[model samples]
Target: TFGRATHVVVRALPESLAQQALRRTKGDEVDFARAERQHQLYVGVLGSKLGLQVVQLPADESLPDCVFVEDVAVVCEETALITRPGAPSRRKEADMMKEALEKLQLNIVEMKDENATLDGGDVLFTGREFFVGLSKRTNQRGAEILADTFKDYAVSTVPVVDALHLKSFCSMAGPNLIAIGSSESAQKALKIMQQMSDHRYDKLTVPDDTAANCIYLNIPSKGHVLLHRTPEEYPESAKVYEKLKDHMLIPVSNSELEKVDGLLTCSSVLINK
Candidate 1:
């Protein structure tokens, strides 16, 4: 139902706590390395196989700080919503991504210099409706702007508190199935998932900090999923990965990326044109 040929944009990471914290513990180090490898594996192996073209952006010194890109911008229907990040350091990162998207000829939906803060990670599209997460990164005003921006689509707001992004806990797995972590919004999302799909609603709960956010690529077209290998360490995640192994699951081993809360979804923007 969705368009194809996703043009992804990625930003090189800098050293920070999220990135350096990986070295403090052996478990974190293993996961970090696995995540980095998976990212590269996605670009080198899955990108060509899926006909995905990737564009890399210059590394920003500011991105080393808190979760930056997640709060910078959002891509919707070829339009890039340039957000005014809640954190001052990330504001420039949004601008940088906007500049790159503009060069790609994607439409621009500017969220002016207001107190409202919107992060791309909080936005989830079902092809017909967009579920916006109202969390610490996104405010009520920002949610209203997103709803108004995507007026043609059914826009709804989902409240989140425990997780980093709505996607950090939940994401669209199949047409009507959503993979979710143990969170308050999981129940509500499951209900919506069932209403959207006639088959059956499925749920996959992950341990703390694993990327529950997943992008469901069309079978044979995008070739399943590309993810970090750290899931092998988590018994539950490994089980989920095994269930979906029929499809290609590319793994990356970028320890630095994971430290900054970067996941498979965070590293790229899916351009459905």
Candidate 2:
């Protein structure tokens, strides 16, 4: 608990994600060493290049998705809402997140109802409003509670399909633009976002489904997008990189993590503090 934030929270990846990560299809082998190097570059860039304080949490070998620290809680400017992850096994990881946030002096709020199932990955904030995706991992109940919790902000549900999370289909790349994927089920939500934003956003559709889920961060040199490696692990990602050439693209290898449906955003949590 200290000075103005400029800090990011991240946990170490577990072998379980590779061994037991849930995937749409078959499981693929994960290179733990390669993933480690990728994570190092990610942290190094955020710290050395971005000049943000990086808090690295210890990894839990038992929990496969433990490295996805963002899902432990949703941190807004006001407070941190510790979530009850949709996955029962993940519920055990909540206390650690609560403890970690406490160490940072963040006001911790817990989801009260037993029925409320939420995941931080399914919650997206566009600076103006919060889009809660109704998916296999997040429910209407959780969305309602979040809306009630943050009465000052507008929170709406985005019905999603054929995807793991709302972020799986689309993510805001900037205040005015969003990167979306060609998932047929996401059409309704796209229209909702387009109409609601008053045509404020430029919906940039990525060529591939996996490339759509990326994280946008503002660094010292330039605002950039962190996503799957381009022309390397994901050849299709190169197309999106070219399309978004106006914006700096920082690629992180997600090949190993992707085997279990993980992405760039799931690895860490950054806050201005």
Candidate 3:
């Protein structure tokens, strides 16, 4: 799953972001205008800077967290797994994703068990294996369903604590490199992943947990491109990213979205074809 991004699917930011979006910790009020500008730049970078086909979906005003389309589906090569989000109100996002994936001609696989709940945010696909985080948004049944869908890869379940999703503290940074947070809970989850997998992976540990939630793309022309949080938000973590001399690191602002527990990887659903 960590490879060239041929097409990226994103949604326009909704005005309801500040008022209705789910947030774990109370923070400053979100600036809607700035959020819009940041999101536009992010989409623009994905399309122009990375030279990838971007499928921009219209914002659903009724659904506050609808812009976080990544939570709706876990996309693999030609197959897209429709997720049943743990949040009851956000379940409709999966239906919308199904419609969009259908139009894209992707083979869609859905959960058979009604009790199974998952969010793409909790699903991390390394280039080799899959690590499904068992958090408030994902369960053991969800991991099993993911394993059944992605039969080619080994799927392991890792318990997540003190985070919104698995990606809230980690994400793939390269072919076998993981950008991880230094938090106790994050480290524990990483330990579980290490024990479960036979394959070895290099780690890029960051001081700030949120800073670890980055998007990595291996573009043919651009080489290794990494989209991460700006230095203003996470200075120490940003310095850590700068250590990767081989990567074309681009800092994207997610100030407003962060207030609502959104990450760099939460805004888009990347498909590598």
Candidate 4:
């Protein structure tokens, strides 16, 4: 029998979500109303389209980046590695996710060193191996700690460049296929891994660097998803979407959320049944 998702954790929109970090900005207020609508559609698809029993975490208004729950923990079956985010403001998020994972009867792995920092966004699992990025937000100490925790799996570090996180330039798609951007750093890092890796990878070029991050659901092959794009965005996204053949090519818009550096995958932590 195939495993169905019993519970997945997500946080509602925080009123201060507009204040979340951004690399660039336009002179305008972050639209809370539109983000709320977009977040609802994202959750709707998870519940109805993806068929997951969604668990909504109470919005922590005090922490602006609280809604991006994926950064707090890495869920692998019954084990959840609680990450200590590099951002001081996001540090509390890890503890909150620990409480939530405990409620779901999952084991928690946490870092012992208070000085060490790791963002779940900097870690990418290729289904067989864990490739963590050594970046501005994540230190070598953090990656070493995570790799130690995941001793059962092949955990290694990759250099991150020109992006907020390693995942901003790459994500898992269909296990073997990786959604990689065209940025110089992305290209170089991807090639370096290809050299030592025994597992061959099929790299999928994203429309652009900004469109690189994606989250592959715990579904059958090619169940690929990216943030919903407009017609302008659809053109670029369609190129990637079409290449996947007949697999589901669903997209949920998060334009407002993007202003706060949010991605579809950043909103929830998948705990597969």
In TM-score terms, which candidate is top? 3
lDDT of model 4, residue 217: 64
Candidate 2 has its poorest 10 consecutive residues by lDDT at 220-229
* Local distance difference test values of all predictions, in order: 0.61, 0.74, 0.90, 0.75
Q: Write the per-residue lDDT of candidate 3 for residues 1-273, one digit (tens) a residue.
A: 367779999988878877888888777999989899999999999999899999888888788999999998999889999989999878877777788888889999987578999999999899798999989989999999999998999999988878989999999988889999999889999989999999988999999999999999999988999999999999999999999999999999998888899999999998877
Residue-wise C-alpha lDDT for candidate 2, range 133-251, written one tens digit per residue: 88888999999988877777788787767778777777767556777776666666777756655346677776676677777765544555444455776677566667676666666
- The residue pairs that clash in candidate 3, if any, are none
Q: Which ten residues in a row have the lowest lDDT in candidate 4?
A: 220-229
Candidate 1 lDDT by residue in tens digits, 99-139: 87898998888888487888777887666577777787788
Count: clashes, candidate 1 = 16
lDDT value for model 2: 0.74
Ranking the candidates on lDDT from highest down gives: 3, 4, 2, 1
| Whole-structure CA lDDT of model 4 | 0.75
Better TM-score candidate (1, 2): 2
- Tell me, what's the RMSD of every candidate? 4.3, 3.2, 1.1, 2.7
Against the true structure, what is each candidate's TM-score? 0.79, 0.89, 0.97, 0.90
- Number of the candidate with higher TM-score, 2 or 3: 3
Q: Can you tell me which runs of candidate 2 are displaced by over 4 Å?
A: 1-5, 196-199, 220-228, 243-246
- Candidate with top lDDT is 3
Candidate 4, residues 218-243, lDDT tens digits: the string is: 45432444333443554676576566
Weakest lDDT window of 10 consecutive positions for candidate 3: 1-10
